Amino acid sequence: ILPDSVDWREKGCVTEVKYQGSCGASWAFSAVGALEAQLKLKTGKLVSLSAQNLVDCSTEKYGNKGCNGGFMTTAFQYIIDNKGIDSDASYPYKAMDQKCQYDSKYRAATCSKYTELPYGREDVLKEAVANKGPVSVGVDARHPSFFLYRSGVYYEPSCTQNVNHGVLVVGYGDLNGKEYWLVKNSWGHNFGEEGYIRMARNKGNHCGIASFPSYPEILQG
Numbered sequence: 001i002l003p004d005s006v007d008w009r010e011k012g013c014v015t016e017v018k019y020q021g022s023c024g025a026s027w028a029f030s031a032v033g034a035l036e037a038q039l040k041l042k043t044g045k046l047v048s049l050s051a052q053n054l055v056d057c058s059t060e061k062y063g064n065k066g067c068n069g070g071f072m073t074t075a076f077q078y079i080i081d082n083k084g085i086d087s088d089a090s091y092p093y094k095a096m097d098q099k100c101q102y103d104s105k106y107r108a109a110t111c112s113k114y115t116e117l118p119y120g121r122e123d124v125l126k127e128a129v130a131n132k133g134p135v136s137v138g139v140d141a142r143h144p145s146f147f148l149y150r151s152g153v154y155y156e157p158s159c160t161q162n163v164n165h166g167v168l169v170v171g172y173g174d175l176n177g178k179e180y181w182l183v184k185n186s187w188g189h190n191f192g193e194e195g196y197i198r199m200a201r202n203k204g205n206h207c208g209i210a211s212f213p214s215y216p217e218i219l220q221g
């Protein structure tokens with residue numbers, strides 16, 4: 001059996017909530033967020049990775065469009081191909097498209113591989129979050145209720161399983177039997193519960209949270 005509840009923040013594996021601003025870079029924050037946790041597990045150091053590095057450098061070859069959107073999976077592939085990603089401190093976020101300024105001097109992580117989970121499987125998603133770490137996912141965030149969410153287990157009747165906003169599942173649990181995913185957003189600390197949103201779990205792939213999950217790994221060799 002899996003634990004009833006997990007919260008990778010309690011294991012020191014989750015950096016501060018970031019603020020994407022007017023740049024549609026949530027895919028980039030989702031990607032680095034998943035990698036930050038694998039890095040902490042392997043090295044003992046928690047260090048924000050450079051979302052801007054991805055925006056500026058993980059571009060056309062990876063099907064990504066900088067501030068106009070992208071994919072976590074090909075973000076990971078870029079880090080594999082590039083043999084590194086800079087720290088956020090060395091390559092901080094500017095919420096706009098820029099020229100690629102990747103520098104191997106300031107590499108703070110690598111990526112060995114990534115794994116994609118099957119569409120809609122919230123049981124498989126739960127197992128990965130428990131056994132692997134935070135999982136990059138897309139959600140359907142095209143709803144005023146999403147922007148307006150303040151607290152509780154978010155359930156939107158009109159939500160769809162088509163995803164358009166990258167976020168990071170850092171855990172799961174229940175509140176009085178209402179099951180939820182613990183989701184790290186990139187809209188700063190003032191959104192939701194200190195930048196997090198708890199989203200309805202085991203409710204028919206609500207908002208497409210398990211439509212396109214994936215997580216990276218950093219192996220010993």
Ligand SMILES: CC(=O)N1CCc2c(c(-c3ccc(C(F)(F)F)c(SCC(=O)N4CCCC4)c3)nn2C[C@H](O)CN2CCC(C(C)(C)O)CC2)C1
Nearest residue numbers: 027062063065068069070137138139162163164165166212
């Ligand atoms: C039915 C649905 O929901 N989908 C359709 C399929 C889909 C979907 C997302 C998905 C997941 C997470 C998010 C996120 F960011 F929200 F988390 C988003 S948002 C994306 C977005 O806004 N974009 C994209 C460019 C600019 C605007 C989409 N992945 N896949 C699968 C990819 O096709 C796999 N792979 C194919 C080869 C690759 C290559 C080699 C051709 O480059 C390109 C990719 C959205």
